[PDB]
Write a protein that binds this ligand. Structure first.
Ligand SMILES: [Cl-]
Ligand SMILES: [Cl-]
Ligand SMILES: [Cl-]
Ligand SMILES: [Mg+2]
Ligand SMILES: [Mg+2]
Length: 263
């Protein structure tokens, strides 16, 4: 048993649905209301409880709209989630890392009392697309207290993430020509320590922009990872260990992990 558990006992179908069981409210954060980042939208459960909190960054030239579906879907499973805009859409990964940090702090300290009262500030995670995924890796390396990190088709010039101790799921796309998995996602995964909880899910038949529209697989494994690591929710281990089979056409190219994952 576990005091951080929220929602019903899961199934694959529950994780694959357009919405989880929680009712999602939205709070707008304008550019000038956000100290240290470009604003965003906070998605949060209307059900009064405390939940973990997650910040999600888009990539270069991207806005919060490119990750909105995923922020809302995650929130609907019982999380407080901010999808950010960056100070400029030209910001590099290490700047996005600090803006993700600022967005976590915003949710904890600067958002409405409705949002702040629903956050367990000790249980935080970060995610991001492309350069936002590079920023996710950088922030994970700077903040070992984070509970989870999910880089989506990540891009970063630094290939060595051996300092990261945060449970990290990297999602790559086999056809990606912008952040090719051979030179980005795979080197990142291979450099993460063998001794941390980590997984690499490479989508088959998928482009760099697979994370930017509703995707059953990305939603399912993102939610399961956050449940397992932000909530310590062992009801979600079954989806992650051993995880999906390799070689599923148009779905999963491969799934690697360090299963079993320690609490
Ligand atoms: Cl990018
Ligand atoms: Cl592509
Ligand atoms: Cl590899
Ligand atoms: Mg709603
Ligand atoms: Mg601002």
């Amino acid at each position: 048993a576990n005091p951080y558990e929220r929602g019903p006992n899961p199934t694959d179908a529950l994780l694959e649905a357009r919405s989880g069981p929680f009712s999602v409210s939205e709070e707008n954060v304008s550019r000038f209301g956000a100290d240290g980042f470009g604003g965003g939208t906070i998605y949060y459960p209307r059900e009064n409880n405390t939940y973990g909190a997650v910040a999600i960054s888009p990539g270069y030239t991207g806005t919060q709209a490119s990750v909105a579906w995923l922020g809302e879907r995650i929130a609907s499973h019982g999380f407080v989630v901010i999808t950010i805009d960056t100070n400029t859409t030209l910001d590099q990964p290490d700047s996005r890392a600090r803006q993700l940090n600022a967005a976590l702090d915003y949710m904890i300290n600067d958002a409405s009392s409705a949002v702040r009262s629903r956050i367990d500030s000790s249980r935080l995670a970060v995610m991001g697309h492309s350069m936002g995924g590079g920023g996710t890796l950088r922030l994970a390396s700077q903040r070992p207290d984070l509970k989870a990190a999910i880089p989506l088709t990540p891009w970063h010039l630094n290939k060595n993430w051996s300092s990261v101790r945060v449970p990290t799921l990297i999602i790559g796309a086999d056809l990606d020509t912008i952040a090719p998995v051979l030179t980005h996602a795979r080197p990142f995964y291979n450099s993460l320590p063998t001794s941390i909880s980590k997984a690499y899910l490479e989508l088959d038949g998928a482009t760099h922009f697979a994370p930017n529209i509703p995707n059953k697989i990305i939603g399912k494994y993102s939610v399961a990872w956050l449940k397992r690591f932000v909530d310590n929710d062992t009801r979600y281990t079954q989806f992650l260990c051993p995880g999906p089979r390799d070689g599923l056409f148009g779905e999963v190219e491969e799934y690697r992990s360090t299963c079993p994952f320690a609490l």
